Amino acid sequence: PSRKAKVKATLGEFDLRDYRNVEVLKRFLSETGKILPRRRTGLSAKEQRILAKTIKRARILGLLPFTEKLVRK
Amino acid sequence: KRQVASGRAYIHASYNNTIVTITDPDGNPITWSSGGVIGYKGSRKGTPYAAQLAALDAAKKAMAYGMQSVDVIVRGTGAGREQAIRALQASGLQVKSIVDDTPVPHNGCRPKKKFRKAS
Amino acid sequence: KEYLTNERIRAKQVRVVGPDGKQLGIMDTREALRLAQEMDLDLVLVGPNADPPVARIMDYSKWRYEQQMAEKEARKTEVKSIKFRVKIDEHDYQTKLGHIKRFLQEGHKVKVTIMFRGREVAHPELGERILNRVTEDLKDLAVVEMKPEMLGRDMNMLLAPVKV
Amino acid sequence: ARRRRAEVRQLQPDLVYGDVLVTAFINKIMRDGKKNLAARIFYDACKIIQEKTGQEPLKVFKQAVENVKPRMEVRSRRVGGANYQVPMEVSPRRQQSLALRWLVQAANQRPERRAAVRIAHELMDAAEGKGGAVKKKEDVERMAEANRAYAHYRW
RNA sequence: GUGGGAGAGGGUGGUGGAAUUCCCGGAGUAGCGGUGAAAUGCGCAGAUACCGGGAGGAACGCCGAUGGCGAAGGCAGCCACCUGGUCCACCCGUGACGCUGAGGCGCGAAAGCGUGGGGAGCAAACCGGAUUAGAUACCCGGGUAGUCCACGCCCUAAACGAUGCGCGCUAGGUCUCUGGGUCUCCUGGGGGCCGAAGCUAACGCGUUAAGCGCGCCGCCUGGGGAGUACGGCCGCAAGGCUGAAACUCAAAGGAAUUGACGGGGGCCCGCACAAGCGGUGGAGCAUGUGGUUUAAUUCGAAGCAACGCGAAGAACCUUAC
RNA sequence: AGGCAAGGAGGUAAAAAUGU
RNA sequence: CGCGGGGUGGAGCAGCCUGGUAGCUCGUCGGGCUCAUAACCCGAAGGUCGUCGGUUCAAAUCCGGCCCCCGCAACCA
Ligand SMILES: [Mg+2]
Ligand SMILES: [Mg+2]
Ligand SMILES: [Mg+2]
Ligand SMILES: [Mg+2]
Ligand SMILES: [Mg+2]
Ligand SMILES: [Mg+2]
Ligand SMILES: [Mg+2]
Ligand SMILES: [Mg+2]
Ligand SMILES: [Mg+2]
Ligand SMILES: [Mg+2]
Ligand SMILES: [Mg+2]
Ligand SMILES: [Mg+2]
Ligand SMILES: [Mg+2]
Ligand SMILES: [Mg+2]
Ligand SMILES: [Mg+2]
Ligand SMILES: [Mg+2]
Ligand SMILES: [Mg+2]
Ligand SMILES: [Mg+2]
User: Fold this and answer.
1) Which nucleotides of strand F lie under 7 Å from a protein CB?
2) Could you tell me if B28 and B35 are in contact, meaning their C-beta atoms sit under 8 angstroms apart?
3) Domain boundaries defined on chain C
């Protein structure tokens, strides 16, 4: 049931609403361009939602992937 | 008559037939194999063994164009995607990587009635 | 149905028949085999009962395949059997008629067959009465193939399309 | 047949050579429980083998068995509404048994007069890598390959 | 009122990729697709599968929830605009201004219809194939309306929490989301689950009550007849509201309980099937039976559990015909 | 490397009318 | 009269054309399967291929004539 690491936990203090912040953001996506859930990221419902929105915005621009590819298989 | 040594292997897989297309690293396909290519009509067309056979055939064809470098790309899921991959690994090519890639709609148009009930 | 090949052939002097419309005589099994090899078409015991067994020089498997294909083709275009009674109702009759009409439209031959009990005395007349009427009704689509003939425990009427 | 795996029987091995396989073969040969009938037959066959193809008759038999032992067999499962001939591995004892059965069948299927003789000939054929038993084995193998697709209905 | 907050609330204008199809371009060849099997279907004018672009239309993957919003129907890419509802905190302002609501007015999924557009997929009807005794069906190949938008109309629904709204009281815990705090705990507002008292026909309900009350509205008085007739209204139509009776039945029902049953599940078993040896059915005959024939073929036994059975001894006897 | 489990796959659960 | 196509187990139709080697469905009867009926499954029963010939070692099959059955025309008179 996945207990490797939490994305909020490995991290320090950061802003949610900056899409222009890709390094800290490419962390909440999957290896496939896909958003990690509550039980993989570790944020508040509200916070998670905000993050998701920001991710979407970024995608719309072109900062983060819409999707990519999983490898090795 | 083209000669390349280098490229990719798409395995597109429906549960009805696991198709394998070998292409150069552009995206121009030299040779391909599927179930019916290995005779196999109908039921068995998309069984794991069939898929494996197809993969082998594809590899053989590639070899007839001096081919070694092969990047795997699996599109969808059929009766034997994993088996096909295994065959490719074994077959006789320098495999790059097994790229897992579904042509999943980002909530597209309505699916068929068989693919209805998915809801 | 075994037309027998090569060394499925036990009989000594087999009548070695060619592929087409020729013969090589009544020769040994080995001889026959050799002949088959020469043509590369198998030696096939097509008439074992015959005055020494008839041994055709044909590729057996291919021939069998062809036969199978033919059989499949024959499977289909076809005949619909509409089963009436003596105790059958007016609405029911109408329904049956409609079905028959549909079949005719499609392009299917029609065995309107009546299924009887005891009283094969006041069965045949009723069978006629139903079936004749039905035929009369569907005349526009249907040329009657088989008339109402009582056949022991059943009765048949059959209809063929006038045109399709 | 739903509890323990149920033991294979502990054969009293051969009196002549000192082996269980031999005994099993004898038993297979014998119908109607007339053992010393068929044991004698087997011995006659062995003698024939020794004479005709000058070799140790147990060894020959073993070789024959080895030749006819099939590692892949076909079962049958109705799956979906279509009956697929299922290609699967064989357990060793079972395989051996099958081989024995086939040998016995071949011995009966042979066109000559006396059973012992027929048996001997069959065994010789098997040793060579030919005859009837071998053919049957080959057929079975083919079946477990012309159906090698449905393999995934893994029983 | 002020200070904030959460949110797929609604509308208007845009955009963002995946995907689909369709077009061109390329490489490439013998099948693809489809199924429980298959066939119709497309493909040598070269399909499918693969890459490059372009054309569209529709929908919004992941997040995404057992979650949030609305009064309900409902609502999700994202952004912008306009814009509702609401929640808290201060307790600051008003001084009972409230609660309910016959009618009325408004909204009201989906389908439907009208006018005009658009049309990729899906896809009623429809045309095929199989499947089948039959196939108007389930399954596949297309396929028209329709789905989509504008404007208009329709107004029904398992329009459900099958729970009318409003406030007051009556143990807790537990998880959730959302606000403030003196922030490992308090205190509001929502969403769930377990349960005190109590209620209930039981199931269950149980501070989001079906508890205890009060307020008002809606409706109910057996089922079928029937949401039908008849009127009346509304509607372009489909139909909708509004709503009987005559007759007919001694029931229609709910909730549980015991069983039985399930082509429901889990756990088990047996020569039950598999694994194997030998048959039965095919032959003659031995027998018993059904049927038939007879003057009588005595009578019974009936799927397993009747059929070398009563009969473990029919020439007469037995024996009953 | 095994150990359990969560999720995603895909394979399987065919068909089979009635009433003394 | 002229021309084309076909005549086949009881009925419908394959095979002919490409000489040897006759199939399916419906119907007949019996069995099975079922607690029982249909349905089902199986069989069993059942055709010398319209017929007379010839061909050829051998004809449903190559070929003629008759017998039919279908249809199309049948004109100048
Ligand atoms: Mg405010
Ligand atoms: Mg193209
Ligand atoms: Mg004050
Ligand atoms: Mg004052
Ligand atoms: Mg469609
Ligand atoms: Mg059909
Ligand atoms: Mg239809
Ligand atoms: Mg369809
Ligand atoms: Mg319209
Ligand atoms: Mg209601
Ligand atoms: Mg109200
Ligand atoms: Mg709410
Ligand atoms: Mg609460
Ligand atoms: Mg209590
Ligand atoms: Mg409760
Ligand atoms: Mg109550
Ligand atoms: Mg109504
Ligand atoms: Mg009216």
Assistant:
1) 5-6, 9-15
2) no
3) 4-73, 75-161
| Architecture of the domain whose range is C75-161 | 2-Layer Sandwich (3.30)
Task: Inspect the structure and tell me whether chains A and D have 3 or more CB pairs less than 8 Å apart.
Answer: no
**B47, B79 Cβ separation under 8 angstroms:** yes
Query: Within 13 Å of residue C104, how many CA atoms lie on the same side as its CB?
Result: 25
**How far is CA B79 from each of CA B33, B49, B50, B114, D88, rounded to the nearest angstrom?**
15, 9, 9, 17, 19
User: In Å, what is the separation between the CA of B78 and the C1' of E50?
Assistant: 18
Residue D71 tokens read as 């590692």
| Structure resolution, Å | 4.2
Q: At D82, which CATH number? A: 1.10.455.10
Alpha carbons B75 and B85: distance in angstroms, whole number: 12
Q: What's the rounded Cα separation, in Å, for the pair B43 and D9?
A: 42
Alpha carbon B103 to chain centroid, angstroms: 14
- What residues of A are in contact with residue B108 (Cβ under 8 Å)? none
Count structural domains, chain D. Answer: 1
DSSP secondary structure code for residue C21 in this structure? S
DSSP assignment of D58-95 equals HHHHHHHHHHH--SEEEEEEEETTEEEEEEEE--HHHH
Which is the CATH superfamily of the domain at C4-73? Translation initiation factor 3 (IF-3), N-terminal domain (3.10.20.80)
Q: What phi and psi, each to the nearest 5 degrees, are found at residue D135?
A: -60, -45
Query: Could you give the number of structural domains in chain A?
Result: 1
Q: Is C15 helix (H, G, I), strand (E, B) or coil?
A: strand
The method recorded for this entry reads: cryo-EM
B101 touches strand F (CB under 7 A): no
